[PDB]
Amino acid sequence: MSTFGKLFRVTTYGESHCKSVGCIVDGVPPGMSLTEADIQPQLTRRRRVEIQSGTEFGKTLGTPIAMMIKRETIGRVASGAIAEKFLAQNSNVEIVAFVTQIGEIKMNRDSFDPEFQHLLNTITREKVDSMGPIRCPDASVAGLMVKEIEKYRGNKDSIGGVVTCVVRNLPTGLGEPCFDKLEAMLAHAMLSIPASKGFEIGSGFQGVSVPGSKHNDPFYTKTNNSGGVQGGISNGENIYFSVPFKSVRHDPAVTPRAIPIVEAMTALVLADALLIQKARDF
Amino acid sequence: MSTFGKLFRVTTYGESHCKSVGCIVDGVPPGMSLTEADIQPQLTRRRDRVEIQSGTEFGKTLGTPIAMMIKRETIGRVASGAIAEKFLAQNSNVEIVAFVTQIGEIKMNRDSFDPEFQHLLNTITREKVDSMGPIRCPDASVAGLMVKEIEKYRGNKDSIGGVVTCVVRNLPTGLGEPCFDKLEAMLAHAMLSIPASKGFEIGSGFQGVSVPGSKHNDPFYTKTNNSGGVQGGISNGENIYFSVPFKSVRHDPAVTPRAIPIVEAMTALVLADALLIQKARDF
Amino acid sequence: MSTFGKLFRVTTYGESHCKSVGCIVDGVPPGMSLTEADIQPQLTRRRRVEIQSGTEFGKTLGTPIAMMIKRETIGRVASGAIAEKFLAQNSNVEIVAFVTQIGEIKMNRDSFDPEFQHLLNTITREKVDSMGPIRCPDASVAGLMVKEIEKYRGNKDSIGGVVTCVVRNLPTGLGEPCFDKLEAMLAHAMLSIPASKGFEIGSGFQGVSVPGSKHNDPFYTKTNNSGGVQGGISNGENIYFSVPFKSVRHDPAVTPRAIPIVEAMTALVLADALLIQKARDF
Amino acid sequence: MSTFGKLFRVTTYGESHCKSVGCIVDGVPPGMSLTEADIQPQLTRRRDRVEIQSGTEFGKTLGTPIAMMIKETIGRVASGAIAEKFLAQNSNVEIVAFVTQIGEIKMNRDSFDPEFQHLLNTITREKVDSMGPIRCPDASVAGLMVKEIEKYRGNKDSIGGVVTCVVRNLPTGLGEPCFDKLEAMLAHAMLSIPASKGFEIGSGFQGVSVPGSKHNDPFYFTKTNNSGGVQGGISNGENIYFSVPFKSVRHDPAVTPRAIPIVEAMTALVLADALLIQKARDF
């Protein structure tokens, strides 16, 4: 399918050999200020757009918004930016993605390490871009990653990595338990990204070796181990999850460019869930 | 939502304090032989009497909603998955086998480049999996270690999570709806919805991130399944394998081994759904 | 498909030769008082039910509610009753259906006739059932219809009719313009009913012969000619529409028994649209 | 919503004050020859240049999203044209719409009148356009309608009408009984059109006054299509015909005759969608 989402939908198209690629976002509420200025940035962070509908006098008409850019994932990033601004206005949410692994160089991301949790609570995109294209906010390994990326560049090879994404200030209740639990929506979103080979949330895979007691005990003051969900619905705590990407044309700069795509998809999932939540709030 | 899937749909219900729990499967083709005998087994593999309430006449599918009731909850899943599995058994020769590959710190080796591991994927069966007993690990050099581990933590009135691994073979090519609904995304959506699951990975997954491009795609390292049976979001005819971590929790600590039938069920529903959608577009 | 609706969903099952038929309603908000007492009446109006989930202490858990009754449309009527009560609480909406034709006996239902508009504004189910099983609230033709029904009963034949449905106190904004305009949702709902051969709203078919000016002029004080929708969304005015039913086993009491089914489907479509509307209210 | 359909989907956009309007069709199978030449005609029949922006390579479908831009319901007509050709190749289906009422001038369309059934079995779009812009294929009233249209044009007024649509050579089985019966899909399609105030199929509203026996009897003094080509909510291989009233009101009063391409377009999308879904379950 090329349509993503239930109430906040995005439909995409785009070949490559062809003139243009774009998408139609439908479900955006009327009001919201929206110009190409709101979109272009996230598109710059992947490296021209024109809104063709859904706006009058720089505001949303609450009708299909079609964007065209002069297969493909700019549809994603673009429609994500709309989603992100929707969420900015209606909730104060921050979504920040960053690189935590490149080949064998792993940034430490243990859910029980309070240094890692401090990173999740404070990291921002400004901070992430500062560290340069490698987009790792841990200096004790960023340049090692760059090193590693150059090793494999030298051999005309390539190497994958891991992106990590945190979301904060998310209201509670988001998620549709049973089949459409928040993390399942998020997992569906990340695995659809080109090159991604999985998804894990909170304690994920590493916490499998750590016991029950240590997960839920209030002193180990207990950290976010769930990844911000309980019973498939947002519990108000931060959300963080990680996505591995494969290397292979090659890259090997694949992982760092995923950041805006991981953020975009996270935005769409989150905007969609906010609508669906609002719908049932009585 | 309580409805899962596009053409092969399952809708579920069930409290616990309440008398029964069940589900309605819709989209099942008419024909297929189906009695409670087809369902009960996978339900036994979770431990609960079942009755088909519609969708069949003379032991065959009417191609109408099939409602099953069992005397929140995931028996809806296992049950409706059993229907899905048989649909797949008839129309494709597909085998879905799940097994335990980690319990606490005891890891069975599951490297996509290790041809011993790939031999496992090509031959493993549920019979073989259950033989090893409730721990459902088919590697003896760590099964009993896992059992040991499960007892340690039982001793301390604690618990510990694990990892289930699932392989799918003889899957026809073309399954998957690239762009947004790529097979692996449908699969990932399916596994993360399972209670206690904290992620999903396919093929080379997370460990393959440290291995270079060349070593992934080279025909000699004779190249093994590293993709996990998908390219461009659609089945390539090679085996599908993926893994799902489960958290410990009340406790368990027998959570991971009991997920097997739930991992298989969801895989079945995803796979039967995608077969329908693929058939739909075959011209 | 056996699933109906987007956010307020109902999934149904039931053969006949089989022991029991039912449905699962999903999307119902938690809170709402609900016992079998709320359902049984609309079921009695078609002529035993048990809620099997979704309630605790006589209140909704906001989880799937499964109902079983000891192909079929009781799934409809039953789930519709939940939908109706949802709407009763959250809006003060009245849905009333009645018989307006049986064979060649037509009750007069011209949208420009203020007598007819008076009926639409005041008719109630009490009033409808009073007239007896024929469920026509115009005495100058009810007994003619009964007469008609008896003629064709005599010849071991049958004859169809027309049900008419009015909805009032509906909030404005309900409807999803472009493809899922309220009247399209309602038309999809009515045509799926067994035996129904169409749907018309407001001025419908008869108003095709009346000119534009007479439709929109404030003096002809202008009456409801639209049927309560503009641009595919509820405008706060009453909604009324009509559905023909075919005769053929036979009946010939088909039309009068459709009343509870027409009301049920109206309920489902309306509760669904309210949810979707709430979702986008910002 | 702006998305229409389940497997054969169309998503649309377009303001008016804006430069351009269009739509993305998704679900179109790869193969089918498709250039702007396939679309432009139906667009001419509404009166606007069109460019395919994706989904094609070397004048053939890639089986990917096809995006069309036109320099609102042209999204409909355009995407309908793709749908129509899909149906032309894979089924030999003919969809013809025509005007059967304008104000008080009614073409006779009684399902029991074999003259009317003859019209349904033979009418074609060529024949319809021939009669000129009024698009009524009954001369004993076409010019009366034109007259009627002119009366009200004189008073700076307007008047609605009724379009009627026949579909033939439709394969049996199309339709998803219970909630998504073919006629309900079609009703949903027609009522979404701007200005439409209803929908009726087969015997419709007039047949309510005719008895059961006369509907089903193999001789009425040989049984005609009274069902409108559906039984139990699924196509029975007989012709489908249905009618949609349009309201007058800016004014027009040429509203009804311009709806023809829109009614055809929507019928196309509904039919192509149902063919896919049907194909999906054929086993």
B119 is catalytic: no
- d(C-alpha B161, C-alpha B159), whole Å: 7
Q: What angle do CA B15, B20, B26 make, to 5 degrees?
A: 90
Q: Token pair of B118, please?
A: 């790939």
Q: Which strand (E) or helix (H) includes residue B255? A: helix B255-281
Cα A209 to Cα A207: distance, rounded to the nearest angstrom = 5
Please give the Cα distance from D168 to D97 (Å, whole number): 12
Task: Tell me how far CA of residue A67 lies from CA of A13, C4, D14, D16, D21, in angstroms.
Answer: 11, 32, 12, 16, 11
Pairing of strands D66-70, D105-106: unpaired
- Alpha carbon of residue C14 to chain centroid: 21
Q: For the domain bounded by A1-282, which CATH number is listed? A: 3.60.150.10
Cβ-Cβ pairs closer than 8 A, A with C, add up to 33
- Burial code (b: 16+ CB inside 10 Å, e: under 16) for A105-118 equals bbbebebbeeebbe
Token code pair at residue A251: 């890259």
Which is it for strands C239-245 and C161-168: parallel, antiparallel or unpaired? antiparallel
Cα D96 → chain centroid? 7
Whether residue D55 and residue A1 make contact (CB cut-off 8 A), yes or no, is no
With residue A1 as reference, give the H or E element that holds it.
none
Q: Where are the alpha helices (DSSP H) in chain A?
A: 40-44, 74-89, 114-122, 125-130, 139-154, 182-191, 212-216, 254-280
Amino acid symbol at A251: D
Residue-wise over D115-136: b if at least 16 C-beta within 10 A, else e? ebbebbeebebeebeebeebbb
3-state secondary structure of D85: helix
B64 to chain D, closest Cα gap in Å: 9
Closest partner residue to B54 (CB to CB) among C9, C15, C65 is C15
Q: Which residues contact D53 (CB under 8 A, 6 or more apart)?
A: A13, A18, A19, A20, D67, D68, D69
* Residues B80 and B190 sit within 8 Å (Cβ to Cβ): no
Partnered with residue B22 across adjacent β-strands are B13, B69
Alpha carbon distance C51, B18 (integer Å): 10
Please tell me the distance from the alpha carbon of residue D164 to that of residue D204, in angstroms, as a whole number.
12
- This PDB structure is determined at a resolution in Å of 2.9
Radius of gyration of chain A (CA): 19
> Amino acid identity of C183?
E
* CA nearest to B67 within chain C: C13
* Chain B residues with a Cβ under 8 Å from any Cβ in chain C: 1-3, 9, 11-15, 17-22, 24, 26, 53-55, 57, 62, 64-67, 72
Partners of residue C10 on adjacent β-strands:
C4, C25
- CA dist., res. C134 & res. C194, Å (int): 19
Structure tokens at B88: 């797949």
Contact list in D for residue A17 (CB cut-off 8 A) is 57
On chain B, the residues whose CB falls within 8 A of the CB of D29 are 281, 283
Listed in sequence order, the residues at least 6 apart from D67 whose beta carbon sits closer than 8 Å to its beta carbon are A13, A22, D22, D23, D24, D25, D52, D53, D54, D55
A172 C-beta neighbours (distance < 10 Å), count: 13
A42, A128 Cβ separation under 8 angstroms: no
Hey, what are D210's tokens? Answer: 């005719």
Q: What would the 3-class secondary structure string for chain C be? A: CCEECCCCEEEEEECCCCCCEEEEEECCCCEEECCHHHCHHHHHCCCCEEECCCECCCEECCCCEEEEECCCCHHHHHHHHHHHHHHHHCCCCEEEEEEEEECCEECCCCCCCHHHHHHHHHCCHHHHHHCCCCCCCCHHHHHHHHHHHHHHHHCCCCCCEEEEEEEECCCCCCCECCCECHHHHHHHHHHCCCCECEEEECCCCHHHHCCHHHHHCCCCCCCCCCCCEECCEECCCCEEEEEEECCCCCCCCHHHHHHHHHHHHHHHHHHHHHHHHHHHCC
> Can you list the positions of beta strands (E) in chain D?
3-4, 9-14, 21-26, 31-33, 50-52, 60-61, 66-70, 94-102, 105-106, 161-168, 198-201, 230-231, 234-235, 240-246
Chain C residues whose C-beta sits inside 8 Å of any chain A C-beta: 7, 27, 29, 31, 62, 64, 90, 178, 275-276, 278-282
Would the CB atoms of D280 and B283 count as touching at under 8 Å? no
Q: Are D129 and D122 in contact, with CB atoms under 8 Å apart?
A: no
- Between CA D167 and CA D120 the distance in angstroms is 8
| DSSP states along D218-231 | S--------S-SEE
**Determination method here?**
X-ray
- Measured between beta carbons, the chain D residues lying within 8 angstroms of B280 are 7, 276-277, 279-280
Given a contact cutoff of 8 angstroms between Cβ atoms, the answer to whether A62 and A85 are in contact is no
Cβ atoms D103, C209 nearer than 8 A: yes
Residue with tokens 């007039």: D206
Label residue A48 exposed, middle or buried (CB < 10 Å: 0-12, 13-18, 19+): exposed
What residues contact C144, with CB distance under 8 A and at least 6 apart? C105
Contact state of C282 with A64 under an 8 Å Cβ cutoff: no
Under 8 Å between Cβ of C130 and C123: no
Please name which of C33, C40, C29 lies closest in space to residue C67, comparing C-alpha atoms. C40
Instruction: Please name the residue that has the structure tokens 């996505």.
Output: A243
Mutate to test the interface with A, among B192, B225, B234 (most CBs of A within 10 A): B192
Structure tokens at B146: 């896992």
Nearest CA among B81, B7, B3 for reference residue B278: B7
Distance between alpha carbon B277 and the CA centroid of its chain, in Å? 19
Instruction: Report the alpha-carbon distance of residue A228 to residue A120 in Å, rounded.
Output: 12
Are the beta carbons of A203 and A263 closer than 8 angstroms?
no
Q: In which residue are the tokens 């979707």 written?
A: C276
Q: Which of C32, C272, C282 to mutate to test the interface with A (most CBs of A within 10 A)?
A: C282
Query: Which among B26, B38, B252, B273 is annotated as catalytic?
Result: B252
Tokens 């000016």, residue located = C213
Angle between helix C254-280 and C182-191 (nearest 10): 150
Q: Are strands B95-103 and B60-61 parallel, antiparallel or unpaired?
A: unpaired
Question: Which helix H or strand E contains D259, and what residues bound it?
Answer: helix D255-281
Q: Give one DSSP letter per residue of B258-271, joined into a string.
A: HHHHHHHHHHHHHH
From D241, D228, D231, select the one nearest D177 (Cα to Cα).
D231
How far apart are alpha carbons A146 and A253 in whole angstroms? Answer: 9
* Token pair listed for B13: 């219900």
Task: Indicate the SS3 state at residue B208.
Answer: helix
Contact A193, A87 (CB under 8 A): no
Query: What is the three-class DSSP state of A280?
Result: helix
Q: Under DSSP, is residue D14 helix (H, G, I), strand (E, B) or coil?
A: strand
Q: What number of other Cβ atoms are within 10 A of residue B272's Cβ?
A: 28
Strand pairing class (D230-231; D234-235):
antiparallel
Taking alpha carbons only, the member of C226, C245, C246, C244 closest to residue C236 is: C226
Q: Which of D26, D38, D138, D252 is catalytic?
A: D252
Token pair belonging to C83: 């939908």
Task: Enter the tokens of residue A176.
Answer: 């549709």
SS3 per residue for A36-60: HHHCHHHHHCCCCEEECCCEECCEE
Cis amide prior to C137 (ω within 30 degrees): no
Cα torsion C279, D1, D3, D5 to 10°: value is 100
A161-168 and D230-231 as β-strands: parallel, antiparallel, unpaired? unpaired
Token pair listed for D42: 């139906």
How many Cβ atoms from other residues are within 10 Å of residue B215's Cβ?
17
Please state, in angstroms and rounded to a whole number, the distance separating the CA atoms of residues C258 and C133.
11
Cβ contact C47:C231 at 8 Å:
no
Nearest to C237 by CA among C185, C161, C169: C169
Please tell me the CATH code under which domain D1-283 is placed: 3.60.150.10
Length of chain A: 282
Residues of C involved in catalysis:
17, 251
DSSP state of B6: S
Look up tokens 């019973």; give the residue. A231
Q: Is the dihedral of CA A60, A63, A64, A70 positive or negative?
A: negative
Sheet of B21-26, strand order = B3-4, B9-14, B21-26, B66-70, B50-52
CB B28 within 8 A of CB B67: no
Which among C31, C62, C282 has CB closest to A29? C282
Cβ neighbour number for residue C213 with a 10 Å cutoff: 17
